[PDB]
Amino acid sequence: IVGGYTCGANTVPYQVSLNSGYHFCGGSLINSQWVVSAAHCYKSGIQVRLGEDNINVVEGNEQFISASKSIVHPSYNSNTLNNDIMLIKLKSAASLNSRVASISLPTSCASAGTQCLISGWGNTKSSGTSYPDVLKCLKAPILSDSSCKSAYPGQITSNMFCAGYLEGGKDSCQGDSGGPVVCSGKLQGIVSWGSGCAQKNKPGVYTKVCNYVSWIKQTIASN
Ligand SMILES: [NH3+]CCc1ccccc1
Ligand SMILES: [Ca+2]
């Protein structure tokens, strides 16, 4: 996250870190046994780390549960990043409390103008690199579909939205991938892609979760 603030320990209780010996992607807990992330975060041998604030320090609220199955969206295209969403099932169910909690799926798509919370452990510089160890938070509005398509001519599908600031300085960034965009207490987006980070007229692009709600529900009902 570039241009954000420190969230505070366990103030984003649905936030997960996907670990393969190191943090590589964020994710969101949608119930005690299922995590949703970006399909471009797919990897074998994922351990899901819940209850994290400092990802380099065991602070006491963590639950490290290995993944038993990962399901990438059947129409994920890695060249266009259309349908950049995947589900991860935990080997055992997470123990849910004030600090580890699932986030609700949407019943409505969020509109342009809606303010949202984006969070992650990704890079905090738009030029060069500095990775935080504690979770960073950013409040950003969903942008109109027409300013999104004007920023990324020919690349925005109906399964994407833009969120952020057209004049840059504030954005999600590398390592924030797969993480949550929560608007009014519902998961509306997944950190998916963009052109660099926090650049003028290059806002973050996010997977539009409301389009995927019945694939998610069907898939967890059957796996
Ligand atoms: N400018 C969009 C933000 C972004 C950039 C790279 C990876 C994930 C998110
Ligand atoms: Ca920790």
Swiss-Prot record:
Predominant subcellular localization, coarse grouping: secreted
Compartments where located: Secreted, Extracellular space
Enzyme class: hydrolase
Activity modulation comment: Is inhibited by scorpion cyclotide trypsin inhibitor TopI1.
Intrachain disulfide bonds: C7-C137, C25-C41, C109-C210, C116-C183, C148-C162, C173-C197
Chemical reaction(s) catalysed: Preferential cleavage: Arg-|-Xaa, Lys-|-Xaa
UniProt-recorded name of the protein: Serine protease 1
Species this protein is from: Bos taurus
Upper classification of the organism: Eukaryota, Metazoa, Chordata, Craniata, Vertebrata
